[PDB]
Design a protein around this ligand. Sequence first.
Ligand SMILES: *[C@@H]1O[C@H](CO)[C@@H](O[C@@H]2O[C@H](CO)[C@@H](O[C@@H]3O[C@H](CO)[C@@H](O)[C@H](O[C@H]4O[C@H](CO)[C@@H](O)[C@H](O)[C@@H]4O)[C@@H]3O)[C@H](O)[C@H]2NC(C)=O)[C@H](O)[C@H]1NC(C)=O
Ligand SMILES: *[C@@H]1O[C@H](CO)[C@@H](O[C@@H]2O[C@H](CO)[C@@H](O[C@@H]3O[C@H](CO)[C@@H](O)[C@H](O)[C@@H]3O)[C@H](O)[C@H]2NC(C)=O)[C@H](O)[C@H]1NC(C)=O
Ligand SMILES: *[C@@H]1O[C@H](CO)[C@@H](O)[C@H](O)[C@H]1NC(C)=O
Ligand SMILES: *[C@@H]1O[C@H](CO)[C@@H](O)[C@H](O)[C@H]1NC(C)=O
Ligand SMILES: *[C@@H]1O[C@H](CO)[C@@H](O)[C@H](O)[C@H]1NC(C)=O
Ligand SMILES: OC[C@H]1O[C@@H](O)[C@H](O)[C@@H](O)[C@H]1O
Ligand SMILES: OC[C@H]1O[C@H](O)[C@H](O)[C@@H](O)[C@H]1O
Ligand SMILES: OC[C@H]1O[C@H](O)[C@H](O)[C@@H](O)[C@H]1O
Lengths: 391, 390
Amino acid sequence: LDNGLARTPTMGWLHWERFMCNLDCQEEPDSCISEKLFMEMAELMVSEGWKDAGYEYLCIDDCWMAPQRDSEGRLQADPQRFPHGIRQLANYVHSKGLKLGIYADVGNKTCAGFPGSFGYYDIDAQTFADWGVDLLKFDGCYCDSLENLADGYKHMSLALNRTGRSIVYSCEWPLYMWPFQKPNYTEIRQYCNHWRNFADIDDSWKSIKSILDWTSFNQERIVDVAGPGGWNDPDMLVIGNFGLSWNQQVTQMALWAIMAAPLFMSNDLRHISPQAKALLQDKDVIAINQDPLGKQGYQLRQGDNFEVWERPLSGLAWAVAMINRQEIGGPRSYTIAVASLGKGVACNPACFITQLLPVKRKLGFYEWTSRLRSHINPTGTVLLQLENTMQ
Amino acid sequence: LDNGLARTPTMGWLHWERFMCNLDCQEEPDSCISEKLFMEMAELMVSEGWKDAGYEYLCIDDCWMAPQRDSEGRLQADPQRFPHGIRQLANYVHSKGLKLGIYADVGNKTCAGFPGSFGYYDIDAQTFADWGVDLLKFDGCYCDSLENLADGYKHMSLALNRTGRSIVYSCEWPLYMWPFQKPNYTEIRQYCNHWRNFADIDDSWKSIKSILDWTSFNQERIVDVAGPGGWNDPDMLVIGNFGLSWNQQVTQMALWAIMAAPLFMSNDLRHISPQAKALLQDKDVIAINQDPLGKQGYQLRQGDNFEVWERPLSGLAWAVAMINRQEIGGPRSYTIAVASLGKGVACNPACFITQLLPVKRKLGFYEWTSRLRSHINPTGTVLLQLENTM
Ligand SMILES: *[C@@H]1O[C@H](CO)[C@@H](O[C@@H]2O[C@H](CO)[C@@H](O[C@@H]3O[C@H](CO)[C@@H](O)[C@H](O[C@H]4O[C@H](CO)[C@@H](O)[C@H](O)[C@@H]4O)[C@@H]3O)[C@H](O)[C@H]2NC(C)=O)[C@H](O)[C@H]1NC(C)=O
Ligand SMILES: *[C@@H]1O[C@H](CO)[C@@H](O[C@@H]2O[C@H](CO)[C@@H](O[C@@H]3O[C@H](CO)[C@@H](O)[C@H](O)[C@@H]3O)[C@H](O)[C@H]2NC(C)=O)[C@H](O)[C@H]1NC(C)=O
Ligand SMILES: *[C@@H]1O[C@H](CO)[C@@H](O)[C@H](O)[C@H]1NC(C)=O
Ligand SMILES: *[C@@H]1O[C@H](CO)[C@@H](O)[C@H](O)[C@H]1NC(C)=O
Ligand SMILES: *[C@@H]1O[C@H](CO)[C@@H](O)[C@H](O)[C@H]1NC(C)=O
Ligand SMILES: OC[C@H]1O[C@@H](O)[C@H](O)[C@@H](O)[C@H]1O
Ligand SMILES: OC[C@H]1O[C@H](O)[C@H](O)[C@@H](O)[C@H]1O
Ligand SMILES: OC[C@H]1O[C@H](O)[C@H](O)[C@@H](O)[C@H]1O
């Protein structure tokens, strides 16, 4: 989308995976979808270094709204759970120097069954701008017409534009299109700042694997359409929760950097390990993801339960990810000629290789004819940065 | 098996899952299957408090053997990887106050393709005893019939007894007959100290789940046969490795205790996190696994992606495990009437409840009328001990 936004992949926090549609503030007050949750999450984003690292957008997902629209036919937030309204939540979020994301649906209802935006595209978009919203995530449920889906996503894109407010437009267009046709990504890129391609992530290694495998299987379709202002969205970062081992967390962080993915954490910033925090806040890994070239990486090799992904960065630098998919035994050795990496351009005539994950370690100078030798933990990833040098 | 052994589930370390069949001592001298690897673990078992916690058997799995038998038709350890031989290794392990486990196969070859014991059961049993072996894991590969399977497991069982040496006998009998015929567990227990029921574990949560699921599905068949001298074996503890989250490691530890399962760690004792070590050495959880009554727990309930398991213990106590199988969202609330626990006796008229996992916490007194409420992490387990008040 040519709105001057998402020149790098969007970074922030989104409630969905960790909090979902918990409406029970009486028995589960700490995990219910409330203004207090977002207020407190915004406080920690500042005080715990998240904003400084680049996580700017505090995002509301589904189940924020009242059962029906008001007397003006406008969306309203739940009166019990958001008694002070979205406008005051946006003011609070902005005062902490952060940006606010909200959620709506192209169809007649949201996925969780609250009021949909079909027939209300122009007022909803204006409503959000009036409330001071900075990002919209726009879902695809309860729209069974291929035409309506496309027209709706297109309509809402222009409906937001016409408010004059800078609002990041997050689309689930391609995901809800697959059931009918192969999505036109040129068309989607024109209207959307980023786009969900694949099934919802959950808190599991199974889910990470299936997202990676779908991406690499479909990479000839989707890699090259990604760029400044339009990104593929492989879904939320789930580091800091319950389902991934440390190595599986390393794999998600490394690969979301390779894929030029929007980085939306879905976790509890009030209850998160120092180890998970350090990984999510890793400035070198975040710098790869946020690389100004804005060129998405890809799978270079697959075989013997190994994967090699790489990503071109600005200034003739490359990020290289090596995954060990064998889920038994111990660390496995992997060797590759550095001439195979970066299309033979990285490391010509030399490169300086620095390991970034699982730990940061300088590996040294590698000549063009040399071999890189590494060891990778089961379900882990080794992430390397290659700096092209004359030395 | 009535040999006076495995009166509680066996506890130890077994190389298979973490170290496998690594024969590459040239490129990987520190992780290949060698005498040295077993010496390193033996030393850490003593020095890192593993032995003090109950882990007594240091066990060699597959891939210890030389490609062929010796001049006298006896099994031999690989000459380059086990230069001093097994008797010498057993000497060393014994001097550390530990016990040595080894591996053989009922068929014509081991699963990795080394010499099988078929046709040599008495020879092999006697050489094992002469070596000072303390435990035998007896696998089921390359056995061409069910009759040969049964006959061989029986034969070796009696052949070990005849040696006069106390040797814990670990059988994979039910696993290899399951695809064809349903096992007779009364028959298996008569001949075996413990028995592998299900597919090899690996370093994954998927694996823990399928083992748990198989066990609860088959529990009517397997629960009651378990007891002192004869245990169900759901395979190795894989805590301390790579594929399990903290909560999934908790689930494995908690449920292997509920299940009165043998506790064979398969990990690297040289590179293990303090967190993993403290869980594996958890005194109170081990004490549940090791409960002298030796009655296997079972799944009490499942629904809304929760499972409840319980186990009767000595002195009218019960262990209770609550698993959250929902792999999305946050810690999730679960409640149960304490009157539904322990067959209605645990908390009549009252019980004191102590949480052991994920952390230790006294929960207080619960009346017959009470409800237990708990938040359980996704893929995690809450493990509690209930003491009847009298
Ligand atoms: C509503 O829709 C319209 C139509 O797309 C949209 O206007 C577009 O905005 C973009 C970005 O604001 C404009 O592109 C600019 O073009 C000039 C001249 O070529 C560039 O100099 C601009 O900046 C570049 O350099 C900067 C670095 O110094 C970067 O910050 C920047 O990313 C660029 O690289 C910029 O590219 C574009 O011209 C218009 N398109 C049209 C047809 O007018 C508008 O922004 C939409 N949104 C809203 C809420 O109004
Ligand atoms: C070979 O097989 C025989 C027969 O199965 C084994 O004998 C059994 O050994 C156990 C343990 O030594 C005996 O149980 C014990 O009995 C005594 C009192 O009689 C009691 O004080 C102990 O607490 C325990 O219950 C068991 O009676 C005995 N069975 C028979 C029928 O003799 C023998 O141990 C085996 N030998 C080897 C080396 O495995
Ligand atoms: C919403 O419902 C109306 C009728 O109430 C119908 O015309 C339309 O097809 C629905 N919209 C979508 C996008 O499914
Ligand atoms: C071992 O192989 C021989 C030779 O064919 C065969 O007769 C015997 O049944 C085999 N034993 C087992 C247990 O597979
Ligand atoms: C099972 O095996 C035992 C011991 O061999 C025997 O006594 C019993 O009759 C068998 N029962 C069945 C189910 O055939
Ligand atoms: O396979 C998909 C990818 O293949 C790479 O070799 C290429 O540089 C990328 O632009 C993309 O096309
Ligand atoms: O109900 C909300 C839910 O709807 C869809 O399933 C989306 O893919 C999720 O990310 C979430 O927004
Ligand atoms: O090759 C050794 C291997 O053989 C079988 O698969 C066993 O069930 C495993 O536990 C292991 O002992």
